[PDB]
Design a protein around this nucleic acid. Structure first.
Ligand SMILES: Nc1ncnc2c1ncn2[C@@H]1O[C@H](COP(=O)(O)OP(=O)(O)OP(O)(O)=S)[C@@H](O)[C@H]1O
Ligand SMILES: Nc1ncnc2c1ncn2[C@@H]1O[C@H](COP(=O)(O)OP(=O)(O)OP(O)(O)=S)[C@@H](O)[C@H]1O
Ligand SMILES: [Mg+2]
Ligand SMILES: [Mg+2]
Lengths: 210, 247, 150, 53, 97
DNA sequence: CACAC
DNA sequence: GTGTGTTTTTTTTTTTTTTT
């Protein structure tokens, strides 16, 4: 629910580290044109007097930008949000509020879109997803649970061809079925199997299939 | 008298059903099924009671499961802002008191009304129904079924009335809906409570090139100024008039 | 003689010992059992010549090494920690802002190492030095109901 | 090998104040190559202390 | 028991089973409350008495209650092929009463 | 109790 | 002169209880 999330980092690299530390040393030397104060009421005057008004050309620019984002994100992986469209609209309105134009021009639309796209490439992984932000369970994570649920179902059916506790399930899943995967994934997938009524769990102990 | 004439035009209208369906949540494009379900929930049934003293629910309980980008929260906002005696709540349980009620000691035990109490004879707009733990879902099992909550914790024992309509909006398990599994599979929410829900609405954000264009254009056009067949004030009087009916 | 005392004073106070009475109605309730107080008359605290003397110490004794051992003469080893303690006691000065002149160190150490003794010595040697444990600072409000102080 | 060994501008502020204290004990304006060498030696000794053995 | 706000002492007030003495007590969702709360009714449903030995107050109340409880089978559905104990989460002593 | 109302 | 009115206190410390 944040329109912009900035991943401000201090990653090590001697080129920019030299410049930053030199600026720090200049700052140390300092103590022993910029509107420094006029902005604090300039912003208020812009907020009061200026009422941004967004145009139909801005509308078309916004629509094309959003559909382009959806397709570039596009298994057609979901990307960004209609809320992200609301965010670009609001950022373009803000860009209209500054420079005292009170009209959301076309340029503001692509400026806000560029800011949003840069932020998205920042906070998302290298294969920009647009889904990890709204959900901890990413596609590359959801595939793990979808594998574990079917693996558990098949293992149960093989056992029947009857009931075992959690530790025995761990013995024949993490050892030879696959690598040393996390244990709670098994019970999380068993919950999903319970939702589909495929198997039943008899308390903390044994568990069987219907 | 002018409102009498407006109501007479409303009742004598032939496409009044479809017009009201379209007039529900003008801020939302499409999803006419959800609009119809919300309209029915607002109308409700008849809260009959048998001679043996057993009461029969007239409230309608609706759970609208959908992806995070869907318009669940917008529907909840429209309902809470339009339906009288309606409150909004989330599955996070922001209030210290539980979603039903709570008892608190004074420095004696006194009752703090939950989100389920204030919306009595109205609609309890519930968000993030998947976020709330089943520990609180079981607390509303009797509330959304028997319309009552019985509490006997410490020195206080009473049964409070919850004659509310529940509007649940929960994301499917894993955030995104999975059509490969049934509605039971796509939710962590369990059978006994959903058997008490009347209708289930599944809304998905299909990666359709055109549908996204109409959605974006509609949103920007709303940002411009939606023309509903009947206004909210005009609709409320007809809803009140229909509530007087006991078919 | 007012304002000559503070709570952190260990003093030899000489004064007149007088029976402050419960004058009013409480005298009837209590009776001959009176209360006492001292009408203090005198107070004695207990608690560049030195500047030339400290140049003399600087020229003679190597402060970096000698005062390091002087901080913890009864503690053997960890002389570099003692030098760090000297540096903390001296402290930087960068009051100009645009930072801070307080040096802060944490002694995680190891149980059984005389960290507590080092802290006690620092408290006994640092002016305005206080010592406390993690579990006992903070602040309190209106502790006595009668006066209702602030 | 431990990630706590990363150098930060906060370490620079600490080094500056340590050098200030060092010259503070030693007359005035003793912050020079010798002062910063002593401060950096102490800082590196402290850092290696965390990596003792 | 509770400290009296007016007279400042511990006093004992009866619970649900006290008000249902020589009557009936109904327990909806008998499978859904805390087991530590569920075990507090053994003396009440068998000895028909409540013994309190807390805060210096020691007494034995009488609760001639008729306990009627409603539960839900494990998973929400009753598997008839299994023994009853396997279809429930409760123990023998609570089942015995 | 006893001085002040 | 007959008869009043104060002084006069709810802290800190245990024990319980519901949530967390
Ligand atoms: N069909 C639609 N018509 C109009 N607005 C829509 C539609 N679908 C989504 N939106 C808008 O998209 C935004 C996000 O949807 P919400 O109603 O806020 O649901 P939500 O909060 O995303 O649900 P979650 O699961 O809690 S994230 C809101 O501003 C909605 O108005
Ligand atoms: N290097 C040392 N020189 C002199 N005495 C020492 C030395 N190391 C330990 N001691 C003695 O050890 C005791 C102090 O140890 P402590 O400081 O209490 O240990 P500790 O690491 O602080 O454990 P705590 O209190 O749980 S943090 C005193 O009796 C000291 O005399
Ligand atoms: Mg929402
Ligand atoms: Mg110690």
């Amino acid at each position: 629910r944040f329109d912009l999330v900035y991943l401000v980092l201090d990653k090590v690299d001697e080129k920019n580290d030299r410049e930053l530390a030199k600026h720090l040393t200049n700052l140390y030397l300092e103590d022993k044109v910029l509107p420094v104060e006029f902005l604090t009421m300039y912003i208020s005057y812009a907020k009061e007097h200026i009422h941004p008004i967004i145009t139909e050309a801005a509308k078309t620019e916004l629509v094309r930008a959003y559909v382009g984002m959806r397709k570039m994100g596009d298994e057609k992986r979901i990307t960004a949000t209609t809320r992200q469209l609301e965010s670009m609209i609001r950022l373009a309105e803000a860009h209209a509020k500054m420079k005292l134009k009170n009209v959301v021009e076309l340029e503001d639309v692509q400026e806000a879109v560029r800011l949003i796209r840069s932020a998205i490439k920042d906070y998302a992984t290298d294969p920009k997803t647009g889904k990890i932000d709204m959900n901890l369970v990413q596609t590359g994570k959801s595939v793990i649970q979808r594998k574990l649920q079917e693996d558990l179902s098949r293992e149960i059916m093989n056992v029947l061809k009857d009931s075992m506790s959690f530790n025995e399930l761990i013995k024949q899943i993490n050892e030879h079925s696959q690598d040393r995967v996390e244990s709670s994934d098994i019970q999380e997938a068993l919950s999903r199997l319970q939702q589909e009524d495929k198997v039943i769990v008899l308390g903390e102990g044994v568990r069987r299939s219907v | 008298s002018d409102e009498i004439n407006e109501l007479k035009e409303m009742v004598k209208d032939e496409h009044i059903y479809d017009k009201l369906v379209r007039s529900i949540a003008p801020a939302v494009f499409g999803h006419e099924a959800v609009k119809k379900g919300i309209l029915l929930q607002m109308l409700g049934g008849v809260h009959k009671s048998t001679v043996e003293g057993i009461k029969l629910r007239g409230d309608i309980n609706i759970c609208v499961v959908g992806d995070p980008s869907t318009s669940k929260s917008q529907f909840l906002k429209y309902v809470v802002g339009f339906a009288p005696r309606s409150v909004y709540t989330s599955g996070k349980a922001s209030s210290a008191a539980g979603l039903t009620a709570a008892v608190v000691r004074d420095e004696d035990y006194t009752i703090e009304a939950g989100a389920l109490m204030l919306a009595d004879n109205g609609i309890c707009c519930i968000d993030e129904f998947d976020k709330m733990d089943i520990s609180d879902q079981v607390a509303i099992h009797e509330a959304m079924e028997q319309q009552t909550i019985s509490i006997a914790k410490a020195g206080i024992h009473a049964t409070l009335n919850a004659r509310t309509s529940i509007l649940a909006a929960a994301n499917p398990v894993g955030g995104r809906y999975n059509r490969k599994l049934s509605l039971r599979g796509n939710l962590n929410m369990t059978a006994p409570i959903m058997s008490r829900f009347d209708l289930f609405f599944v809304i998905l954000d299909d990666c359709n090139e055109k549908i996204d264009t109409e959605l974006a254009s509609h949103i920007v056009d709303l940002h411009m100024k939606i023309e509903p067949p009947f206004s909210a004030e005009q609709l409320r009087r007809y809803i009140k008039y229909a509530r007087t009916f006991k078919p | 003689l007012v304002r000559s005392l503070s709570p952190g004073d260990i003093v030899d106070v000489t004064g007149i010992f007088l029976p402050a009475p419960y004058t009013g109605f409480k005298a009837l309730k209590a009776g001959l059992l009176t209360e006492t107080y001292l009408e203090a008359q005198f107070v004695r605290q207990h608690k560049s010549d030195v500047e030339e003397r400290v140049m003399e110490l600087i020229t003679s004794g190597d402060v970096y090494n000698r005062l390091a051992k002087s901080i913890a003469p009864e503690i053997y080893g960890n002389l570099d920690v003692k030098k760090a303690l000297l540096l903390l006691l001296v402290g930087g000065v960068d009051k100009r802002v645009g930072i801070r002149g307080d040096i802060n160190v944490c002694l995680m150490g190891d149980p059984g190492v005389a960290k507590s003794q080092l802290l006690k010595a620092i408290c006994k040697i640092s002016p305005r030095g206080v010592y406390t444990t993690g579990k006992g600072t903070a602040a309190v409000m209106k502790d006595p109901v009668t006066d209702e102080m602030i | 090998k431990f990630s706590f060994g990363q150098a930060t501008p906060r370490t620079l502020l600490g080094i500056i104040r340590l050098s200030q204290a060092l010259a503070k004990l030693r007359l005035a304006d003793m912050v020079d190559i010798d002062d910063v060498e002593e401060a950096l030696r102490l800082v590196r000794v402290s850092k290696e202390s965390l990596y003792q053995e | 028991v509770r400290k009296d706000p007016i007279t400042k002492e511990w006093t004992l007030e009866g619970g649900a089973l006290v008000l249902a003495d020589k009557g009936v007590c109904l327990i909806d969702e008998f499978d859904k409350m805390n087991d530590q709360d569920r075990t507090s009714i053994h003396e009440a449903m068998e000895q028909q008495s409540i013994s309190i030995s807390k805060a210096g107050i020691v007494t034995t109340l009488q609760a001639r209650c008729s306990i009627i409880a409603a539960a839900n089978p494990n998973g929400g559905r009753y598997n008839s092929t299994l023994p009853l104990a396997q279809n429930v989460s409760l123990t023998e002593p609570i089942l015995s009463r």
